[PDB]
Amino acid sequence: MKILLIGMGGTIASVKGENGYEASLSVKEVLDIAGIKDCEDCDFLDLKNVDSTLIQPEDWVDLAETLYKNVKKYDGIIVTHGTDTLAYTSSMISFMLRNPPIPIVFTGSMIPATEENSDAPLNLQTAIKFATSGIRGVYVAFNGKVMLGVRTSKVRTMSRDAFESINYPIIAELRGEDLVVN
Amino acid sequence: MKILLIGMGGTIASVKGENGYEASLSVKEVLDIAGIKDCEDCDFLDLKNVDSTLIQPEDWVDLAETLYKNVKKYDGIIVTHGTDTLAYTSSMISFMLRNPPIPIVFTGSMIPATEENSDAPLNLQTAIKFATSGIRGVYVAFNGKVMLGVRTSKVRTMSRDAFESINYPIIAELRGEDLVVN
Amino acid sequence: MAVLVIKLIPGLSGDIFRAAVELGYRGIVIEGYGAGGIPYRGSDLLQTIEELSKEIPIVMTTQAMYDGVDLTRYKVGRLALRAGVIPAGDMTKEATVTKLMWILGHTNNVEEIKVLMRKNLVGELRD
Amino acid sequence: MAVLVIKLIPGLSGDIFRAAVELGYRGIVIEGYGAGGIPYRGSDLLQTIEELSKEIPIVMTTQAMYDGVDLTRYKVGRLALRAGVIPAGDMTKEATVTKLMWILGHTNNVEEIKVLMRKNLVGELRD
């Protein structure tokens, strides 16, 4: 029931102005604007606020250190991330944190959390439900599916169904309020 | 009703020995071993007998010249080809032969025509049915589908359903003895 | 003529693109992330492209299988465009590579190549 | 350390691989066709790999999205193996690149890297 949410930026947290500026929400702001009010005991940590296209290998070191110092203190961790290099990060973190004691769930959205039709609420609810499972490891939640993080690829560039599990079964799939694993 | 079949090699024409040699059937041998007996007026031309992985840009020049000197003499042309670079060839030929007067259909198989469970008969029947349509252009037939040749990609490496039309509707799909275009 | 296709990965530098140009490659395709773009901080890749894109065509497609690129959609895209990157739109990777090859076969004028790559020649592209 | 990912296309030569090694790249991934392999006639690519694969790991994955590689399935595969190419099995391209990067972070022994790449470390590979 105790969850840590770590922000890295991405479209999910994106906020655009008419002045031509591009700003970014913190993780807590993302959850609140996405309308997740059922997050009972949740902490928040803002590690980065970048377009994921900017991600470099040094960022994976930072993220892994951060994860390593929190895996014992939480029952689950969620990392919000841009979709562009999300599967790269989830892959590298999988090699860096061999055998996490908890679920570590990467997610994001194709449409900013600030828009009315965003996929952010579905993705966050999915990640949250899975961070409460007892299933240890590194995963990606997107479009109602939970996929093994080291078997995930971005497959579509302009769709809500942006990710797939490649050559491996999907871990779980949302059906109502239920994550189903078969 | 007058069709030219051009062989380039590939798995479809592959024949392996216990001596460790690898041999290749000509196009006519492929059709006959695949059991296509309904090919009324068909000519045959063997341009190459190679694993398609070997294809280089100079081969596209040869193939295009060959095609250019036959497009007027036939109602349809079929080219048998290895699956590895099939979509490359069908793409380049599409730029080289702008506006062919006839259908030009690339095809092949994941399983050699000599095996009992081969996809060769389905692929060849599909290509033949489409070479008899009045629909001009460069296309790929595979697994019962006809796809625009310049929108085709190899998507699977170990399946009969090896190709897809990317960001474009499938041209036609087999249902019985019928090619359906919607 | 000779084309080089390079996948964009985190931390990829511009030095191999220089080497490619020096080696006599007449075109380069970059498979970017998502709808396409070049990282503007964290590497010299963007600066390198600004320079090279006026000497040979630099084409951007996507590493994803479906939906293609749209360099107007994001800042990383708009800067790639500013830097002279030619978008591949919704073309397949096979169409993108072969189309570039075909074009290079009868012009090396980068701005001419740019126009051709963006024009639907035979059904490969929505222009 | 630094990894380079190159898509195999018809007529691709070995010269850019030499340049990559000379530039100090510690690993190279090749996205081949289908179940994987290197053309044995028509280019100097295979000969170049025979040489370079003992200095840095050369990894082979596929350009296709599903089913991965199997270098034992075809002659072009078996010669790639003979030439010292490390297969990526059924790994994603993201797992392949990042796994190589991670390994290179604590050894540059090519034969050691070879073993690691072929071992299922965390669920990324069927070994």
Residue numbers in the entry:
A (entry chain A), B (entry chain A): 1 to 182
C (entry chain B), D (entry chain B): 200 to 326
Sentences from the paper on this structure:
To visualize the structural changes accompanying PfA under high temperature conditions, crystallization was setup between 30 and 50 °C. However, no crystals were produced under these conditions. Since the residues involved in interactions (described above) were also present in the linker-less PfA variant cPfA, we attempted to crystallize the latter under high temperature conditions. Therefore, to get the structural insights into the oligomeric forms, we attempted crystallization of the cPfA at higher temperature. Detailed analysis showed negligible structural differences between both the structures (R.M.S.D at Cα, 0.12 Å). Thus, an increase in temperature had negligible effect on its structure. Furthermore, the symmetry-based N-terminal domains were bound by similar interactions as present at 18 °C. The absence of linker in this protein might have provided more flexibility in the alignment of N- and C-domains within the functional dimer assembly and as a result, the interactions between the N-N′ domains of different functional dimers became much stronger. The interaction analysis showed that 2 salt bridges, 8 H-bonds and 86 hydrophobic interactions were present between these domains. Residues R175 and D178, reversibly formed a salt bridge while G134, T168, E177, L179, V181 and N182 were involved in hydrogen bond formation. Importantly, as compared to PfA, cPfA had double the number of inter-chain H-bonds and hydrophobic interactions, implying that the N-terminal domains of cPfA were more strongly associated with each other.
Variable temperature solution light scattering and/or SAXS experiments have provided important findings about influence of temperature on protein shape or association levels which expand our understanding. Previously, we provided a detailed structural and mechanistic insight of thermophilic l-asparaginase from Pyrococcus furiosus in its full-length (PfA), and a conjoined functional version (cPfA) (domain architecture shown in Supplementary Fig. S1). SAXS and crystal diffraction data analysis brought forth that despite lacking a 19-residue long linker which connects the two domains, namely the N- and C-halves (N-PfA and C-PfA, respectively), cPfA adopts a solution shape and crystalline state that is comparable to wild type full-length protein PfA with improved specific-activity. In conclusion, the findings reported here provide structural evidence in support of temperature induced higher order oligomer formation conferring stability to thermophilic proteins thereby regulating their functioning.
